[PDB]
Structures are given as structure tokens and as C-alpha cells.
Symmetry: C2
Subunit: 225 residues, 2 copies
């Protein structure tokens, strides 16, 4: 009976989307009581102008995370100046893979300190990580002082798994929140991810999921009868 809407970060990140489409996307989400909307930097100002109660989240160095630190910082800074309340920042996976852990932590710390007012979520790209790397990823995000660790950008051949979220939840030990995203297109999946540890859910199907929840809540029993 989980109110999934409050966990949803509805994403409208497709490049072919018009500004009008972004506007109505933000409106529908607000109407459905969805917690937040995730958009690309170009759409931050627009989203914040339309949004009333819905939080405005902006993707930084998305989706590849291979922009220079200075560029990620500028993008993070400008995102907040355009009205961003939350930042889903893609870390530098190549540096991580090259074992430049300090560089990864410092890039995140620098981006965070230049944007103290926003909630910081670090996308670590779990579909490219094995168990050990995920444990390291968690320690990196915690050392960086992130509020959340986001599993995936969606730009991968595999969606996030329940195993991945369960592991992150266990490794975290309550010192960081978890955002499950990537391949989540329905209510049952969103619910399972939350039950597995997710504190927030990333999806581009937030409207459909929110409606399916509404339908079930209106029709099926579960209250006090």
C-alpha cells in the first residue's frame, strides 16, 4: 500500500522533447502528486517556472559523466541558479575504472561545495559494476558527502536489479540514501525496488505508474474496510 508518488522522480530527458512537452510533463506530474521532475539543464528554468510543489531535479554531466570537472561544476552551479533544488550528478566512471578514486571523490566534493543548497545524488552506473565495485562506489559517495547514490542513467543494455539496490542498502548502513533508476517502467517494479531499499525511484513512466497506483487504490481494498 506504498504511496509510490512520493518516491517518484519523473524524468523527461529525451532530446527530441519540445519545451511544450516539458511544460505539460511538469504539469501532469504536479497534478498526480509526484514528488519531483528530473530534466536536462536547458529545461531547468522552464521547469522551475511551472513547478509549484513538485521538486525540480537537474541531471549533471548526464548521461556519460565524462565532462571535465570544471564543466561539471559550471553546469551544477548554473542548474541551481536556474531553480534546481536537486542534482543527479554522473560521476567519472572512467576515472573510477582507472582506480583514480581520490579524483572521483574530489570531483564530487568540489561540485557539492559549489552547490550547497541542492540535494546531491551521485549516479554510479551499476550495470557496469560488479559487487566489489559497487561496495567501493558506496564508500566513495559517502566520503564525498552525497545525500543519495543513484544506480543508473538508463543508458545501458541492462536495467538496475533488485540485487543491486539490496547490496547498496546493506553496504550503506544508513549513512546515505538510495535512488533506484533504469528499466523501471511499471508499478510492480517500482514497489519491489522500494521494498528492496530504494528511498527514491527514477523513471520516465511516473505518470503511468502514478495512475496505476491511483486505479488500484480506488478499486482494491486495503485500509480498514
Amino acid at each position: 500500500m506504498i504511496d509510490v508518488r512520493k518516491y517518484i522522480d519523473n524524468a523527461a530527458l529525451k532530446p527530441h522533447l519540445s519545451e511544450k512537452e516539458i511544460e505539460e510533463f511538469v504539469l501532469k506530474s504536479e497534478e498526480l502528486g509526484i514528488y519531483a521532475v528530473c530534466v536536462n539543464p536547458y529545461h531547468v528554468k522552464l521547469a522551475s517556472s511551472i513547478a509549484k510543489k513538485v521538486k525540480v531535479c537537474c541531471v549533471i554531466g548526464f548521461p556519460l559523466g565524462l565532462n571535465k570537472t570544471s564543466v561539471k561544476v559550471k553546469e551544477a552551479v548554473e542548474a541551481v541558479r536556474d531553480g534546481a533544488q536537486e542534482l543527479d550528478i554522473v560521476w567519472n566512471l572512467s576515472a573510477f575504472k582507472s582506480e583514480k578514486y581520490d579524483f572521483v571523490v574530489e570531483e564530487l566534493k568540489e561540485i557539492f561545495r559549489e552547490t550547497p543548497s541542492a540535494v546531491h545524488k551521485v549516479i554510479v552506473e551499476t550495470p557496469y559494476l560488479n559487487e566489489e565495485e559497487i561496495k567501493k562506489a558506496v564508500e566513495i559517495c559517502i566520503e564525498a558527502g552525497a545525500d543519495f547514490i543513484k544506480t543508473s542513467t538508463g543508458f545501458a543494455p541492462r536495467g538496475t536489479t533488485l540485487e543491486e539496490v539490496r547490496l547498496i542498502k546493506s553496504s550503506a548502513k544508513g549513512r546515505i540514501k538510495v535512488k533506484a533508476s533504469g528499466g523501471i517502467r511499471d508499478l510492480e517494479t517500482a514497489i519491489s525496488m522500494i521494498e528492496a531499499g530504494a528511498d527514491r525511484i527514477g523513471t520516465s513512466s511516473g505518470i503511468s505508474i502514478a495512475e496505476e497506483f491511483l486505479k488500484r487504490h480506488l478499486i482494491l481494498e486495503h485500509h480498514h474496510h
Copy 2:
């Protein structure tokens, strides 16, 4: 075959690639005589530090093109300083779709002017455009003064087709060059794309293609 290596922009853009792999990629491409390597901003310094004859290309605002103009500018400038000789810039498709053509042209013009020493290629993302939008795309790239109009980006449900290349070439009518990319995995395809009008080939399988070219040459003669 008409030496396809001179047309190849070998791309190494997956984020899971370590810096050791990027180095090996650039080295291998160099040994095979590939025209250029295409990398993300972070890898430009590394790529240029090992590249001898291969040209260094950097993707800007890649692959979504929805970054602010200001950041795309900074990214482009930083790329040049790191050693980039060519820049493959993703235009703002949202703005395009919203009919903000002037915005789109102006963003590109601005990026180009801050990096006058680099070859400028505009990725228009053809898999998200119909025939009419492709023709408008061509007129935008020409108006912006780009050297090449690039088809895909690689992150799309479909690659480029011979029909798209033929279309772009005829619409261009010698006013801009064409770089075909997206789904080009082998020599046969690379050759057909060039025959269709491609002046450059964007591919992540450049090593395989160049090797196939050498093998055919050495085995046939």
C-alpha cells in the same frame, strides 16, 4: 575499396572504458592509419598526448545536446586547449523541435567562434528527425557555417541509412560536407556510406574496419 581509413573517425565513447583502454585504442588506431579518434572531453589530453598523425576529435554537449550554451562553450574551449583538432557538437534538439531555429543557429555560431581553429561538425540526431526536419537541419548547419553535418550520435533506436546520407548530400548540394555515423559496423557498410555521399565515417569499430581493409589489400593486391 578506396582507402576507407582516411575517412574514419574511430570513436571510444563508452564511460566504462578505463584510461588504459583509451590509450590502447588511440595507439591501435594510430598504427592502422585511421584518420582520427573521437573521445569524450575527459580523455582529450590523454588522446592528444599519444596521438602522432591521427587527428583528435572531441564530442561536445554529447550525446543529448541539452546543456546550456555557456557550458557547451566552456567544454569546446577546454577541448581545444587539451589538444582537440576537431569538434563534433550536438545541437540543441529540444530548441529545434520547439522551432527556436535562431537560438539553435546562434548557439552553434557562438561555439564555433570561441574555437576558430577546430573543424566543426554538428550532430543533428537523424534518428529523431523525419525527412523534412533533415532538410531544415542541413540549412541550419550551413547557416551556422559548420564544416560537416553529422547524422546520429550512436545513442538512438536506429542507425543511419544509405537513404539518409543520399538525402543529406543532395540537400547539401556542395554547401557542406557529410559525416555518416550510427550503426556502421563493418567495411562493406563503410564503403557503401562513402559511395552514398559520406565525406567522413563515424564508427566505434574503426579498428576492425581498417584491419579488414588491410587484410583485403594484402590478400588480394
